[PDB]
Design a protein around this ligand. Structure first.
Ligand SMILES: *[C@@H]1O[C@H](CO)[C@@H](O)[C@H](O)[C@H]1NC(C)=O
Lengths: 48, 48
């Protein structure tokens, strides 16, 4: 669902879906070839 | 007729083997893609 998300201070708008991206434990968010945020990590559930 | 048939048969090889042209279309595609990539990458600049 398209919502305004505030992930640990990171403010944005969009729809959050389950991700096949496998973040390494130290990685907190993912970016795209043009430095656009593609993925995030949930502070509570540690979900990508 | 035999000469024309031989030449038109050799066309299917010479179009992609001898190169020369057919790089113009790919150059157009690459120029447009690179321009769009630069435009969307300029959104990561702070500009002061
Ligand atoms: C926050 O608590 C949840 C359970 O309520 C836990 O699964 C999660 O790991 C915790 N987050 C931390 C410790 O960053």
């Amino acid at each position: 669902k398209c919502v305004n998300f505030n992930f640990n201070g990171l403010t944005g708008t969009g729809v959050l879906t389950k991700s096949n991206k496998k973040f390494l434990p130290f990685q907190q968010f993912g970016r795209d070839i043009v430095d656009t945020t593609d993925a995030v990590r949930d502070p509570q559930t540690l979900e990508i | 007729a035999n000469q024309f048939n031989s030449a038109i048969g050799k066309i299917q090889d010479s179009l992609f083997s001898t190169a020369s042209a057919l790089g113009k279309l790919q150059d157009v595609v690459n120029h447009n893609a690179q321009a769009l990539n630069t435009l969307v990458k300029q959104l990561s600049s702070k500009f002061g």
